[PDB]
């Protein structure tokens, strides 16, 4: 009813070019008011895209994007109000050769004072011109060679391992990845990671100079982290032995779908993780029984293949008794927005959207009185509630501008009087926006970001340092001048995937290290706990194996099943006996509304929460390419993928976080 006369329109010029995107925004509270939102696209004399303007900024004579191309329409130079200015160029072979980023302006001209220049080097003739190295140089500083590739030859030794023509040695920002063996099916059977020595010091940086691997191997720490894989005839992975010797095993059905999975801890016997897994005709998971006897049943809508039911239960005849642990029921609008959710065990979440399918209202429950939402998790409710009066109902309202910037989250919890409003202050010349506690003046928002559009201050006392590639380097949590600061640093591989996280807090010093490897998280705590987290699935089931510092209250090699919702948010942790360990509910944009557990000690070992992503101690969710602020409803930096999902480079899953999920950030 709210959607009458709200189509999507594309307006063309006389040469088949889309010069206008027209939407029609209508709020359910004011159904007589329809805002015509117009996005403008201007094309040049050569028929290529030159300018793009959102409905908001166009009114203020500011251009979201400007492009300058070659004679074929390939973009060379870009001006972004969100991502700053950039310059790229590819060669005649189509390969990237240069990318200059983090450029601003002011005085009129472009400010190159902090420009980052990444260049790509390839094998020269008579070689096939394979990738040779990647060089990275910040303005005024020396160039570092951040990547180097080494390829195997034609020797019988190399052929027997199927390595001929393969990049056998990859030197990245973290150190070295060696490919030891390749399957007959072209799949890696053995890879080994070596870390650069002293990655604990944030000032030590990779720099692979020259063409001698002997001189480089000396810069690597001694430990070798080898992941071994065994694949089937169709190239699918069957077994995996991680760097510490644990094995994951899978088996597929007659249709080649994952049908069972097992785990064999080092020195242990094989045990069932997933016993049986059935699928719908559309290949969606239907019934999934785990080793804890717990059964998840997925119910789908016949006409649409939409997931309308998620039922996790201890079935009849279970050793711990029959019980429905979770029974999520989804009701959708004809377009597929989640209108409502129910859980059987009365509780109900209701949702209202605008004609653009932006979430404008959300009802739910929280443990009241929690207090005003921030970067922190609520204190866990221990033990598990027996009564539901412990929860109170809340209603949140969401307010967006013409460019999709979430400006306001109005939290209303009347009964416990837990009422507050989270305001986001948006720039008047960009999509850059921060919480009002940082500034309430639109004119001061842009200074709080880099030229690339990466946020420099998380909260009031907390600053953000970034890598030249735009990766998050350091979160300064408690600054103490000189020179003992509560902080958390990060390291990434050549693919910009996180490999290392180091948290430091003053007490000599509490240091928490997290090493991310295939199917494995190696977490140490000093100031000593040595924890190895086996990640099973792709991550669904997690196993906690202590080599040292196992706390009382938790048995070693503890298996934790995770049970999610529609958008993959970890809601229930359940042990090997099928007993609920923790339960967690989320505000639509990620904040934790409910956090409960059967013990205080088991709470500290859940890291993955919203959208199946890890929440770091900083409060940020790490998605892969970008960090997410669940309290501000937006990304911490501009989309590195650019305009693939609209002009707004900060907008979070198109402002519909109940239907949509983001896999990486990018």
**CB neighbour list of residue 527: distance below 8 Å, 6 or more residues apart:** 505, 507, 508, 509, 510, 511
Q: Is 580 exposed, middle or buried (0-12, 13-18, 19+ CB in 10 A)?
A: buried
Tokens for 83, please give them.
Answer: 């991502």
Nearer to K ion, 183 or 278 (CB): 183
Q: How would you label 516-552 residue by residue, b for 16+ Cβ within 10 Å and e otherwise?
A: bbbbbbbbbbeeeeebbbbbbbeebbbbbbbeeebee
Nearer to K ion, 606 or 651 (CB): 651
DSSP track, 29-74:
T-TT--EEEEEEEEE-TTS-EEEEE-HHHHTTT--SEEEEE-TTS-
Among residues 6, 34, 119, 264, which is the contact residue for K ion, using CB under 5 A?
Answer: 6
CB of 484 to K ion, least distance (A): 55
Strands 35-43, 49-53: pairing is antiparallel
| Distance of alpha carbon 537 from alpha carbon 242, whole angstroms | 14
CB of 186 to K ion, least distance (A): 11
- Which residues from 51-110 bind K ion, rule CB under 5 A? none
CB of 659 to K ion, least distance (A): 15
Nearer to K ion, 162 or 337 (CB): 162
| Distance of alpha carbon 619 from alpha carbon 373, whole angstroms | 11
Residue 169 in the binding site for K ion (CB under 5 A): no
Per-residue binding letters, 426-445, with K ion (x by CB under 5 A): --------------------
CB of 17 to K ion, least distance (A): 24
Nearer to K ion, 35 or 111 (CB): 35
Nearer to K ion, 4 or 495 (CB): 4
What's the full length of the chain, in residues?
A: 666
What stretches of 152-304 adopt beta strand conformation (E)?
A: 167-171, 175-182, 188-195, 225-231, 237-241, 247-252, 258-264, 271-279, 285-290, 295-300
CB of 159 to K ion, least distance (A): 5
Nearer to K ion, 162 or 179 (CB): 162
- Which residues from 466-525 bind K ion, rule CB under 5 A? none
Residue nearest to K ion (CB): 6
CB of 164 to K ion, least distance (A): 8
User: Which of 617, 621, 620, 604 is closest to 531 using CA atoms?
Assistant: 604
CB of 1 to K ion, least distance (A): 12
CB of 646 to K ion, least distance (A): 16
User: Which of 649, 83, 593, 634 is closest to 407 using CA atoms?
Assistant: 634
Q: Are 463 and 489 spatial neighbours (Cβ–Cβ below 8 Å)?
A: no
Sign of CA pseudo-dihedral 490, 635, 106, 68: positive
Q: How many CA atoms lie within 13 A of 21 on its CB side?
A: 12
Judged by CB under 5 A, the stretch of 1-9, 32-40, 55-63, 595-603 that binds K ion is: 1-9
Nearer to K ion, 6 or 392 (CB): 6
Nearer to K ion, 637 or 655 (CB): 655
CB of 357 to K ion, least distance (A): 7
CB of 341 to K ion, least distance (A): 23
Nearer to K ion, 180 or 207 (CB): 180
Nearer to K ion, 318 or 352 (CB): 352
Nearer to K ion, 27 or 634 (CB): 27
Please report which helix (H) or strand (E) contains residue 412, including its range. strand 406-412
Nearer to K ion, 24 or 262 (CB): 24
- β-bridge partners, 90: 96
Sign of CA pseudo-dihedral 13, 17, 19, 21: positive
Q: Are 301 and 552 spatial neighbours (Cβ–Cβ below 8 Å)?
A: no
CB of 191 to K ion, least distance (A): 18
**Cis bond upstream, residue 138 (ω within 30):** no
Applying CB under 5 A, the site for K ion has a residue count of 4
Q: How would you label 250-271 residue by residue, b for 16+ Cβ within 10 Å and e otherwise?
A: beeeeeeebbbbbbbbeeeeee
Nearer to K ion, 6 or 412 (CB): 6
Q: Are 221 and 194 spatial neighbours (Cβ–Cβ below 8 Å)?
A: yes
| Distance of alpha carbon 434 from alpha carbon 449, whole angstroms | 10
DSSP state of 457: B
Q: Where are the alpha helices (DSSP H) in 435-579?
A: none
User: Which of 447, 444, 356, 446 is closest to 400 using CA atoms?
Assistant: 356
CB of 490 to K ion, least distance (A): 39
Nearer to K ion, 133 or 337 (CB): 337
Q: Supply φ then ψ for residue 611, to 5 degrees.
A: 55, 25
| Distance of alpha carbon 292 from alpha carbon 270, whole angstroms | 14
CB of 8 to K ion, least distance (A): 7
Q: Are 343 and 349 spatial neighbours (Cβ–Cβ below 8 Å)?
A: no
Nearer to K ion, 6 or 213 (CB): 6
- Which residues from 325-364 bind K ion, rule CB under 5 A? 355
Q: How many CA atoms lie within 13 A of 232 on its CB side?
A: 12
| Distance of alpha carbon 65 from alpha carbon 575, whole angstroms | 51
Per-residue binding letters, 145-164, with K ion (x by CB under 5 A): --------------x--x--
Nearer to K ion, 182 or 544 (CB): 182
CB of 398 to K ion, least distance (A): 18
Judged by CB under 5 A, the stretch of 6-14, 98-106, 324-332, 650-658 that binds K ion is: 6-14
Tokens for 597, please give them.
Answer: 């557990």
CB of 306 to K ion, least distance (A): 19
CB of 657 to K ion, least distance (A): 19
Per-residue binding letters, 236-275, with K ion (x by CB under 5 A): ----------------------------------------
Residue numbers at the binding site for K ion (CB under 5 A): 6, 159, 162, 355
């Amino acid at each position: 009813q709210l959607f009458s006369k709200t189509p999507s329109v594309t307006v063309f010029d006389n040469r088949g070019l889309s010069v206008r995107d027209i939407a029609y925004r209508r709020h359910p509270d004011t159904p007589k008011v329809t805002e015509e939102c117009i996005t403008y696209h201007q094309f040049d004399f050569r028929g290529f895209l030159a300018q793009s303007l959102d409905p908001r900024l166009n009114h203020k004579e500011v251009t979201n994007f400007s492009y300058l191309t070659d004679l074929n329409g390939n973009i060379i130079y870009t001006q972004s109000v969100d991502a700053g200015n950039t310059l790229v160029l590819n060669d005649t072979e189509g390969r990237s050769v240069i990318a200059m980023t983090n450029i601003s302006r002011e005085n009129g001209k472009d400010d190159l004072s902090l420009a980052v220049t990444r260049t790509f080097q390839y094998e020269n003739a008579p070689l096939p011109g394979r990738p040779l190295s990647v060089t990275e140089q910040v303005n005024g500083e020396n160039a570092r060679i951040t990547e180097h590739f080494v390829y195997a030859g034609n020797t019988p030794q190399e052929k027997n391992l199927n390595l001929a023509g393969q990049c056998v040695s990859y030197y990245d920002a973290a150190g070295l990845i060696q490919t030891d063996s390749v399957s007959l099916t072209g799949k890696p059977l053995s890879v080994s990671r070596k870390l650069l020595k002293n990655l604990d010091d944030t000032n030590i940086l990779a720099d692979w100079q020259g063409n001698d691997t002997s001189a480089w191997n000396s810069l690597l720490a001694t430990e070798i982290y080898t992941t071994v894989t065994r694949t089937d005839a169709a190239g699918a992975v069957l077994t995996t032995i991680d760097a510490v010797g644990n094995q994951q095993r899978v088996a597929f059905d007659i249709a080649g779908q994952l049908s069972a999975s097992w785990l064999t801890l080092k020195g242990g016997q094989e045990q069932v993780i997933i016993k049986v897994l059935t699928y719908s005709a559309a290949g969606q998971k239907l019934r999934e029984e785990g080793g804890n006897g717990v059964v998840t049943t997925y119910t789908y809508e016949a006409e649409t293949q939409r997931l309308i039911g998620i039922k996790t239960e201890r079935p009849n005849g279970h050793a711990a008794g029959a019980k429905v642990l979770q029974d999520l029921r989804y009701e959708y609008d004809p377009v597929g927005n989640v209108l409502s959710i129910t859980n059987d065990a009365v509780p109900e979440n209701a949702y209202r959207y605008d004609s653009l399918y932006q979430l404008v209202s959300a009802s739910g429950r929280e443990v009241a009185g929690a207090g005003q939402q921030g970067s922190d998790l609520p204190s866990p409710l221990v033990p598990l509630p027996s009564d539901s009066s412990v929860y109170t109902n809340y209603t949140r309202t969401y307010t967006y501008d013409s460019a999709g910037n979430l400006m306001r989250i109005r939290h209303s919890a009347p009964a416990t009087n837990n009422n507050y409003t989270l305001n986001i202050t948006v720039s008047e010349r960009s999509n850059r926006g921060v919480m009002s506690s940082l500034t309430e003046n639109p004119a001061d928002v842009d200074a709080l970001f880099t030229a690339s559009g990466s946020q420099k201050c998380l909260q009031q006392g907390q600053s953000l340092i970034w890598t030249p590639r735009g990766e998050l380097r350091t979160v300064l949590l408690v600054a103490r001048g000189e020179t003992a600061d509560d902080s958390e640093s990060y390291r990434y591989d050549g693919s910009s995937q996180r490999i290392l996280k180091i948290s430091s807090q003053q007490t000599s010093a509490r240091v928490q290290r997290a090493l991310y490897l295939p199917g494995l998280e190696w977490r140490t705590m000093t100031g000593a706990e040595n924890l190895q987290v086996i990640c099973i699935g792709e991550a669904q089931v997690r196993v906690l194996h202590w080599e040292s510092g196992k706390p009382d209250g938790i048995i070693n090699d503890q298996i934790r099943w995770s049970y999610d919702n529609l958008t993959c948010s970890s809601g229930l942790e359940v042990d090997g006996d099928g007993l609920v360990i923790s339960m967690e509910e989320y505000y639509p944009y990620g904040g934790t509304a409910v956090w409960a557990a059967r013990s205080h000690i088991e709470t500290a070992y859940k890291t993955v929460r919203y959208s199946g992503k890890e929440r770091d101690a900083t409060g940020l969710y790490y998605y892969g390419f970008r960090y997410y602020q669940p309290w501000a409803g937006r990304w911490l930096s501009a989309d590195p993928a650019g305009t693939v999902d609209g002009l707004n480079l900060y907008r979070m899953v198109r402002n519909n976080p109940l239907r949509l999920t983001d896999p990486d950030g990018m």
